[PDB]
Amino acid sequence: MKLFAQGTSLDLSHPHVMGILNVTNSLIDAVKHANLMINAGATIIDVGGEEVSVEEELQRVIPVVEAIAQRFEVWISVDTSKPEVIRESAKVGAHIINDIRSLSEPGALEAAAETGLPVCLMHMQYDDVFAEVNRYFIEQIARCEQAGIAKEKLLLDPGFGFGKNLSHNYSLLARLAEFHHFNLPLLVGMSRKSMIGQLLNVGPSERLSGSLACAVIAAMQGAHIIRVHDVKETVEAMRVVEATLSAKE
Amino acid sequence: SMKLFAQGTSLDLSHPHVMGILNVTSLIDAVKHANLMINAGATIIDVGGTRPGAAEVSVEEELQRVIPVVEAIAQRFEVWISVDTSKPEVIRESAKVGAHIINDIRSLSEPGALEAAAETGLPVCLMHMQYDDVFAEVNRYFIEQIARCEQAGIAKEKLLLDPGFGFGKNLSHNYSLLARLAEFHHFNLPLLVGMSRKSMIGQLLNVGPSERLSGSLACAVIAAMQGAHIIRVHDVKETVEAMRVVEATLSA
Ligand SMILES: C[C@H](C(=O)O)c1n[nH]c2nc(N)[nH]c(=O)c2c1=O
Ligand SMILES: C[C@H](C(=O)O)c1n[nH]c2nc(N)[nH]c(=O)c2c1=O
Known part of the structure; x- marks a missing residue:
């Protein structure tokens, strides 16, 4: 199970730290930071600046993708919902459209087809959160298939955070591997989220450990992309989960 | 449901525990390090005076080191206490002073340890150490020492099972155990594991003993999500943080 973008490939045979x-400053404060995270072992960067106008956003997010495409052989993930951004990021060397809104903005769906790139779908917004999020995946995967973006370019993100309380959050985390039925890659972002801040009662700086544990639980069920802030630590932990799932038969 | 019973008190093995x-x-310094771990969530304290090539201590030295420490805790905290020792005197004497768990990494193999672990009606932790299957070899070892213990005074509802992380097992042997670990629940006996800053993290990381916290946290959370009841760590504030989220996914 691979991804293909801008001529390259991403091997989802082992888990991946984004x-x-x-x-x-600004632009240099950006390339410095991505340098470091690539040094840490990040295999994808998630660029983003989001509301704001589509000119503010292009102004900020497009040059930064450019410098990274023309300095590191790392994959590049644009976090945005606007169609101009989708089509311009693709024209500079981005690999994944990452839309938290799931292509919902006018013309974003079509712009995302227009690029031929992988696109990540995240759920947002009766206590069957798993049915709720599965059927949201069953809906949107068809909405995109009608748009002509092949299912094999589709990435699933349950939507940790945003509008879900503690209970719902951890029911998803518990039933993560049940989404493997799609045969689609699973991206997860839980780092420093409130499902760690409430459980541990610590400022946003010190959630590193409850974070790391969410990253391992995800990955032990086969999650493919994990979206964090503390990359060096998550890579190291990801090293020993690969060592574990390789010891199986 | 499992619960461990010693010194007239119990132990809720349903949720995991941090040792x-x-x-x-x-001794002032020992009680200080006890309080901090207790604050950081530690439900058990392993008291220790067991490393390959380390100075052989005497039995006078041991009781000198370890017996005043269990005393200071038993009367100042409500925490459960494990003694890490392999000597019969240290067993009997520490049992007298309010010790809860016997932790013999040499699985009561010293002359008179089995007997001494009998005369004290406390839980004993069995530990495997030392071609076909390292899980097979570990399991047949638990099959053995679970019987030699039962034929001795003690019951099966007193035993703790612990495979042998560290202790010369190579990186795959280590990581294969961590992957079949839930299979040891077939015993229907508590699972205690210890992996903080071991060589399975030291090798696969190429990293010094200090900076293995993240790798260690991971091995704990893999072990916890498979149902290990007790987890032995130096970095306790960080382990109970990780176990809280483990508890949260296991539950909801
Ligand atoms: C604003 C927030 C954050 O960075 O904390 C956030 N932005 N973008 C995201 N994209 C994906 N695929 N999954 C996520 O969870 C996620 C976030 O949580
Ligand atoms: C760090 C040291 C070593 O490996 O040399 C060591 N001492 N005492 C121990 N007791 C239990 N129950 N389990 C263990 O793993 C363990 C150790 O690993």
Whole structure:
């Protein structure tokens, strides 16, 4: 199970650490940061600046993708919902459209087909959160298939955070591997999220450990992309989960 | 459901537990390191005076080191206490002073240890150490020492099972055990594991003993999500943090 973008490939045969690059100096404060996270072992960067106008956003997020495409052989993930951004990021060398809104914005769906790139679908918004999020995946995977983006370019993200309380969150985390039925890759972002801040009662700086544990639980069920802030630590932990799932038969 | 019973008190093995490590190699300093682990969540304290090539201590030295420490805890905290020792005197004497778990990494193999672990009606932790299957070899070892114990005074509802992480097992042997670990629940006996800053993290990381925290946290959370009841760590504040999220996914 691989991804294909801008001529290259991503091997989802082992789990993958993606760092976060909120681009909200500036441009140099951005390439410095991505350098480090690549040094840490991030195999994808998640660039993003989000509301704001589509000119503010292009202004910020597009040059940063450019410098990274023309300095490191790392994969590049654009976090945005706007169609201009989708089509311009693709034209510079981005690999994954990452839309938290799931292509919902006017013309974003079509722009995402227009690029031929992998696109990541995340659930957002009766206590069957797993049915709720599965059927949201069953819906959107068809909405995109009608749009003509092949299912083999589709990535699933349950939507940790946002509007879900503690209970719902951890029911998803518990039933993560049940989404493997799609045969589609699973991206997960839980780092420093409130499902760790409430459980551990610590400022946003010190959630590193409850974080790491969410990263391992995900990965032990076969999650393919994990979206974090503390990359060096998550890579190291990801090293020993690969050592574990390789010891199986 | 499982629960461990010693010294007229119990132990809720349903949710996982974090065991700290109190190396005693003074006593003021031991009680201080006890309090901090207790604050950080430690439900058990392992008291220790067991490393390959380390100085052989005497039985006078041991009781000198370890017996005043269990005393200071038993009367100052409500925490459960494990003694890490392999000597019969240290067993009997520490049982007298309010010890809860006997932790013999040499599985009561010293002359008179089995007997001494009988005369004290406390739980004993069995530990495997030392071609076909390292899980097969470990399991047949638990099949053995579970019987030699039962024929001795003690019951099966007193035993703890622990495979042998560290102790010369190579990186795959180590990581294959961590992957078939839930299979040891077939015993229907508590699972205690210890992996903090071991060589399975030291090798696969190419990293010094200090900076194995993240690798260690991971091995704990893999072990916990498979149902290990007790987890032996130096970095306790960090382990109970990770176990809280483990508890949260296991539950909801
Ligand atoms: C704003 C927030 C954050 O960075 O904390 C956030 N932005 N973008 C995201 N994209 C994906 N695929 N999954 C996520 O969880 C996620 C986030 O949580
Ligand atoms: C760090 C040291 C070593 O491996 O040399 C060591 N001492 N005492 C121990 N007791 C239990 N129950 N389990 C263990 O793994 C263990 C150790 O690993």
